[PDB]
Design a protein around this ligand. Structure first.
Ligand code: 46C
Length: 342
């Protein structure tokens, strides 16, 4: 007569509260598998994320702890909601796994990126990304690693960001996706809030091109793809780089870059009606202001929200919503356990 039961999901066991039924794996990330499930108590579908021994190293431990704390403070429609948290283990010494129960949506932004979207849906998704990032920024959280695999959407075009970013070493096969990180993250130069604007620009550009904008095996290839398309940065940008980094950037092959009309031609946009022709030119204008290498010249979150492509959605309830170190593995274990048990 225990509150829990176990089922096999791949080569992992999910041990969950009996209220959660008919689990089905929907995806996997760096922290492992997420299942969809029916919650018999709430009478709705939910997502269940299993953290296996998150205290096992600093990198897992710090993300798990941060995720728990921030999910409990933050309440915004464009940030994914935490519904419940549990461990099946009964004592700290027995403690192994943490299960996060989240609201469930319909699809990954990666799936939406593959679609041809009208301007109304495209702009509304972007508005919602900006709103969620704005709310984060107002709580002092700068995400720094926004990427489409970690944003989810519903059939009615509502959007939620799944994680809180952060930007080290783990011995797993999992490969971290870096295509969406800002120049200042890539070149390790320090950053402000509009570091996240670059990532939105990369996603928007990909929604249009249906190809990843700046792929690369690692930061070297990636920087190559940046300057080859946007062109070599100006001198005032060069001055803000650490000395070893500056020499490297100043010595790469030079490129003029492409115009934004060439980068995102009208053939990529809905452009049959006068409405869509105007929207395409507006979409291209915002792209030209987000995909800007020098953060001092890159558009801010607030100005982006005011941009004509975006501002048709503006709602102060949504935009100006009220805002909310290191240890050993044993220390992290108790921190996380304490958080879990409230
Ligand atoms: C590819 C999975 C995916 O996009 C996803 C993930 C996800 C994101 C990255 C890694 C792991 C999980 C997710 C994770 C948490 Cl914590 C909460 C909600 C979701 C979610 O709503 N979806 C959409 C979704 C929901 C059901 C199905 C389905 O029924 O097939 C497909 C997509």
């Amino acid at each position: 007569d225990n509150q829990f039961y176990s089922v096999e999901v791949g080569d992992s066991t999910f041990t969950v509260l009996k209220r959660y039924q008919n689990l089905k794996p929907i995806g996997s990330g760096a922290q492992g598998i997420v299942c969809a499930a029916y919650d018999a108590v709430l009478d709705r579908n939910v997502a269940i994320k299993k953290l296996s021994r998150p205290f096992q190293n600093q990198t897992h431990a710090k993300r798990a702890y941060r995720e728990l704390v921030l999910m409990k403070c933050v309440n915004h429609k464009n940030i994914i909601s935490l519904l419940n948290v549990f461990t099946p283990q009964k004592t700290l010494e027995e403690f192994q796994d943490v299960y996060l129960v989240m609201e469930l949506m319909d699809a990954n932004l990666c799936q939406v990126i593959q679609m041809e979207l009208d301007h109304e849906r495209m702009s509304y998704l972007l508005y919602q990304m900006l709103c969620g990032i704005k709310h984060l920024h107002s709580a002092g959280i700068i995400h720094r690693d926004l990427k489409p695999s970690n944003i989810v959407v519903k059939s009615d075009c509502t959007l939620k960001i799944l994680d809180f970013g952060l930007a080290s070493f783990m011995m797993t096969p999992y490969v971290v996706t870096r295509y969406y990180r800002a120049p200042e993250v890539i070149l390790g130069m320090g950053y402000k809030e509009n570091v996240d604007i670059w990532s939105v620009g990369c996603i928007m550009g990909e929604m249009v091109r249906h190809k990843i904008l700046f792929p690369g095996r690692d930061y070297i290839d990636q920087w190559n793809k940046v300057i080859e398309q946007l062109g070599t940065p100006c001198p005032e940008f060069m001055k803000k780089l650490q000395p070893t980094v500056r020499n490297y950037v100043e010595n790469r092959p030079k490129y003029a870059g492409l115009t934004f009309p060439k980068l995102f031609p009208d053939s990529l946009f809905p452009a049959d009606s006068e409405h869509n022709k105007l929207k395409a030119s507006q979409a291209r204008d915002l792209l030209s202001k987000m995909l800007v290498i020098d953060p001092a010249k890159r558009i801010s979150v607030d100005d982006a929200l005011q941009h004509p492509y975006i501002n048709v959605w503006y709602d102060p309830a949504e935009v100006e919503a009220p805002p909310p170190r290191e240890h050993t593995i044993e220390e992290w274990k108790e921190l996380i356990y304490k958080e879990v048990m409230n």
